[PDB]
Amino acid sequence: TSLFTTADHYHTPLGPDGTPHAFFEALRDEAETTPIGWSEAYGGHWVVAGYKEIQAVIQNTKAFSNKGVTFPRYETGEFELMMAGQDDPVHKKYRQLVAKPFSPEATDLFTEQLRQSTNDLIDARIELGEGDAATWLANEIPARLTAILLGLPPEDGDTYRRWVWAITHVENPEEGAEIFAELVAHARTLIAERRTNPGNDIMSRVIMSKIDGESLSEDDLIGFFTILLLGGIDNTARFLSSVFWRLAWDIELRRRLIAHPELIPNAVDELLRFYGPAMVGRLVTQEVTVGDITMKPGQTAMLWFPIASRDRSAFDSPDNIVIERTPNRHLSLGHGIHRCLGAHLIRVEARVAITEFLKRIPEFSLDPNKECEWLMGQVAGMLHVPIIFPKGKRLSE
Ligand code: HEM
Ligand SMILES: CC1(C)O[C@]2(C)CC[C@H]1CC2
């Protein structure tokens, strides 16, 4: 038998711990012999699991197009995913408009706002001694940051989460499309308001931008709105939820981050390696051979980053969280021309989130009377992480 034959990122076997990591480890073992395999799922597609094979695919933009970045395709109506769903020269043209606001220098400026936000959020339940770390904290830190980036009201997270759920998980196609159409309606309204009253946020920036002397179409602006929403509300939230779950039970990891705060940045990169939630697809546009496998135009290759990030030929002791690991050339944020636009921002965000969480609540554990839940998909991670902790005090009454 082979684990590739029915591999499906939306239907990964979960182990007794509640994660797909036993399955991922078994697939990684198989990938040492067969780094690329055919899956019968989604009508047939290639699963790319080896580190060097993923790198070969991701670097070869001539044969592998980002038109297949989401597979099955996200529900975004007739709109394509801005930057992520495009090839050069179109892709580069748009990324250039937002490179600066996402640079390390610029994103470092969010640090104190995030620190304050994390503490204000913790205040909401610290006196209760219990809460769902995903719903209460991991979801809300990036939701509020995303609202700030987009110039939206930070308190409307539930609305934003409902849009993103429709894009990424709603089964019924008509329901999904209708809810994405609600996002579009809200985006158009936002865009019109900012045309006359622009702020300092990223939507205002692109709305006032030009390419070769021309303003962006409303459709292109809706694309920008949608991709930034996804990175925050889906990718970041699921990553942080998985991290908080791990910290809840792994008392050895936890004590080391508290004793050595200087290691938190390196530990965040190791946690990205280990709990990085994303996979991406590529559409094959010309016949190409990778390793032993020849792929044909029209086929899709899924890049199983979590498996490659556990490849023994790329990482010593890959199944262990080695917080002092360096270098750490993991693929959780991609590589090459499409490498995560939000990479520096989310590294800052994670550092702060972990730091303040462990400062405020050094002692906690998983709730024995409530269930954790892992969400499978193209972005996969914990969705519910009930924890308990000694009742504490608010910083701000
Ligand atoms: C832990 C959180 C996140 C993870 C793990 C993640 C992961 C990734 C990955 C793997 C890619 C590569 C896409 C590919 O190769 O096709 C990517 C691209 C991208 N991400 Fe992130 N992402 C995260 C958060 C964010 C955030 C917060 C934002 C924006 C505020 C964002 C915006 C983007 C954009 C625009 C691209 C496309 C870049 C391009 O095509 O040049 N992401 N992300
Ligand atoms: C999964 C991944 C990497 O996240 C977004 C934000 C970028 C590319 C794809 C789809 C949406």
Side-chain angles (χ1 to χ4, degrees):
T1 60
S2 167
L3 296 169
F4 286 102
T5 309
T6 63
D8 181 339
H9 47 291
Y10 283 77
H11 299 280
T12 55
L14 303 179
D17 60 322
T19 78
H21 284 176
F23 171 65
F24 286 359
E25 287 160 20
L27 182 57
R28 180 276 316 284
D29 290 352
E30 193 177 331
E32 293 191 340
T33 299
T34 304
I36 305 179
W38 183 257
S39 169
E40 295 292 320
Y42 303 107
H45 72 284
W46 297 110
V47 171
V48 188
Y51 184 94
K52 289 183 289 296
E53 288 73 24
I54 289 189
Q55 294 288 11
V57 171
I58 229 169
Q59 295 179 7
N60 184 349
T61 58
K62 176 181 64 165
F64 292 99
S65 165
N66 269 56
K67 296 301 163 186
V69 65
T70 67
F71 181 80
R73 186 188 185 98
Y74 280 10
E75 176 60 68
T76 62
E78 291 194 339
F79 302 86
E80 63 179 11
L81 284 184
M82 175 63 66
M83 292 171 284
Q86 300 156 333
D87 300 317
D88 284 345
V90 171
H91 155 265
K92 172 191 291 292
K93 163 182 70 182
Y94 290 121
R95 184 160 175 159
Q96 277 166 358
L97 302 181
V98 294
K100 188 177 297 168
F102 282 99
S103 66
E105 293 74 25
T107 54
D108 277 339
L109 300 176
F110 290 95
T111 300
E112 285 312 306
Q113 174 193 139
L114 287 161
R115 193 184 313 286
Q116 184 70 59
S117 180
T118 298
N119 280 291
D120 294 344
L121 286 165
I122 289 165
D123 280 351
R125 304 193 67 88
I126 194 169
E127 297 177 338
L128 298 186
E130 49 78 24
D132 186 324
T135 71
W136 155 42
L137 289 179
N139 285 358
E140 279 292 291
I141 295 165
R144 285 164 185 274
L145 171 63
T146 301
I148 298 324
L149 290 180
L150 293 176
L152 295 164
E155 299 290 341
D156 289 341
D158 285 354
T159 297
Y160 310 143
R161 282 180 283 274
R162 173 165 172 281
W163 296 341
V164 167
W165 183 254
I167 291 167
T168 60
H169 291 283
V170 167
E171 302 279 29
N172 185 287
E174 290 78 32
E175 183 193 344
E178 195 286 325
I179 296 170
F180 177 76
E182 292 178 48
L183 172 158
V184 173
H186 285 241
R188 292 183 173 129
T189 297
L190 181 277
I191 290 166
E193 296 294 336
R194 294 307 185 195
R195 286 195 190 280
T196 72
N197 183 35
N200 61 340
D201 61 278
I202 294 181
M203 280 310 292
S204 293
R205 172 181 181 91
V206 300
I207 294 166
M208 298 305 149
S209 297
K210 301 193 180 304
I211 299 172
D212 302 320
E214 196 52 57
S215 296
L216 297 186
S217 69
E218 194 189 53
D219 290 342
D220 283 344
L221 299 166
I222 289 163
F224 272 104
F225 183 89
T226 298
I227 203 73
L228 306 177
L229 201 72
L230 287 160
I233 304 297
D234 191 22
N235 304 25
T236 305
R238 302 284 63 77
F239 172 61
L240 293 177
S241 299
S242 293
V243 170
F244 293 168
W245 173 78
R246 181 55 178 247
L247 291 171
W249 70 259
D250 189 342
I251 58 174
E252 171 183 283
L253 174 55
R254 192 198 305 160
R255 64 163 174 87
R256 290 172 182 156
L257 299 187
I258 294 172
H260 289 264
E262 78 278 2
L263 291 181
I264 286 172
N266 213 70
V268 164
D269 296 333
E270 178 67 342
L271 288 163
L272 281 164
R273 186 180 68 86
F274 207 83
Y275 287 111
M279 295 185 196
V280 299
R282 295 289 188 266
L283 176 65
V284 178
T285 59
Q286 63 184 241
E287 180 169 312
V288 58
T289 298
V290 187
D292 302 327
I293 301 301
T294 302
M295 307 182 177
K296 307 183 304 108
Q299 294 179 333
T300 295
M302 272 305 290
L303 313 187
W304 278 52
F305 293 143
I307 313 296
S309 294
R310 287 166 165 83
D311 191 325
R312 293 182 177 102
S313 68
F315 303 91
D316 285 352
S317 308
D319 294 336
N320 295 85
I321 297 177
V322 181
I323 63 171
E324 73 267 28
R325 186 186 300 274
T326 175
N328 189 346
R329 297 174 74 181
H330 66 72
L331 287 165
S332 303
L333 297 166
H335 186 75
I337 66 165
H338 294 284
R339 186 179 180 272
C340 185
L341 178 68
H344 194 87
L345 182 58
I346 67 94
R347 289 169 80 220
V348 169
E349 185 176 5
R351 178 191 91 233
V352 170
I354 293 165
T355 293
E356 300 304 305
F357 184 27
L358 296 184
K359 182 177 185 182
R360 296 294 298 286
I361 309 184
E363 301 177 15
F364 60 108
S365 61
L366 293 175
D367 192 335
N369 299 313
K370 292 180 184 285
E371 294 289 277
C372 291
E373 183 184 11
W374 179 276
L375 177 66
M376 308 180 286
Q378 175 156 350
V379 171
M382 287 295 182
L383 180 68
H384 291 288
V385 183
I387 63 164
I388 56 176
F389 47 91
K391 297 179 175 170
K393 275 125 209 70
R394 307 174 65 119
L395 293 180
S396 188
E397 103 175 48

